Design a protein around this ligand. Structure first.
Ligand SMILES: [Ca+2]
Length: 279
């Protein structure tokens, strides 16, 4: 399938080179997979989600996304225009309040929720979790991310936006999950992207157009935006049968565009998520 004039990030993910605007993907499109977006929530009623999004959990007085951040991330995972996996099921878990903040304790509970909750969902092709959040190193946060992953969920997390080594951030520093740095449309490491040995992959993160609350759209930037590209890619690849929750991060690293990014610090992977789709 070919989507013309796609957001640059979608195009980049199906391309061997920067500077193209069409997104290419197998039409299975992540059908029969599920992605949990653990964030400020999802505006499920947005036309771009077509009935495939649902709020499953909140730790606050409402499950609505009163911020827009979670809705943007979800749109990058699986909205029809702005999404990588255009046919996936999207499940929202609101661990972040409408200011985009959340106590580590609520975030942990949300991770443990998904690990159980996937048993109440229909996801024959596999389960993915997108965590576009983080804070200072916490062994308890990392451990919760490691449980989610061990339970059979492909866990993708933001490296963080401090232009710093991500070893000092959680869940970014957890070895067993997929830690995602941010790149721009000229294949530069995004100026704010964290780096370091704990990174597994880069995805598009600068000037990323996606869904917003109030049924609209906007372009915003962060390893928050890169993460759902990789989460959506894993879902897509899982439905294609190419990989599984336990091996998807490795598989993505293995099949990535390699050596193409600029301003990658010595010791950080130079790998850009790529779907290797042959139209
Ligand atoms: Ca990692």
């Amino acid at each position: 399938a070919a989507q013309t004039n796609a957001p640059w990030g979608l195009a980049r993910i199906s391309s061997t080179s920067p500077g193209t605007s069409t997104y290419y993907y197998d039409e299975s499109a992540g059908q029969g997979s599920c992605v949990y977006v653990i964030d400020t929530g999802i505006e499920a009623s947005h036309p771009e989600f077509e009935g495939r999004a649902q709020m499953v959990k909140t730790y606050y007085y409402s499950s609505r996304d009163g911020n827009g951040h979670g809705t943007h991330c979800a749109g990058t995972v699986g909205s029809r225009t702005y999404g990588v996996a255009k046919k996936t099921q999207l499940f929202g878990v609101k661990v972040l309040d409408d200011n985009g903040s959340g106590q580590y304790s609520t975030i942990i509970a949300g991770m443990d929720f998904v690990a159980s909750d996937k048993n109440n969902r229909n996801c024959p092709k596999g389960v993915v979790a997108s965590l576009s959040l983080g804070g200072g190193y916490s062994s308890s946060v990392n451990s919760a991310a490691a449980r989610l992953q061990s339970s059979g969920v492909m866990v993708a997390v933001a490296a963080g936006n401090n232009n710093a080594d991500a070893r000092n951030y959680s869940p970014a520093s957890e070895p067993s999950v997929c830690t995602v740095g941010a790149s721009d449309r000229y294949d530069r490491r995004s100026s704010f992207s964290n780096y370091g040995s704990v990174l597994d992959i880069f995805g598009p993160g600068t000037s990323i157009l996606s869904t917003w609350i109030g049924g609209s759209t906007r372009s915003i930037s962060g390893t928050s935006m890169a993460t759902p590209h990789v989460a959506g890619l894993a879902a897509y690849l899982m439905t294609l049968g190419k990989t599984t929750a336990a091996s998807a991060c490795r598989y993505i690293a293995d099949t990535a565009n390699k050596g193409d990014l600029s301003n990658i610090p010595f010791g950080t992977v130079n790998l850009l998520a790529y779907n290797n789709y042959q139209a």
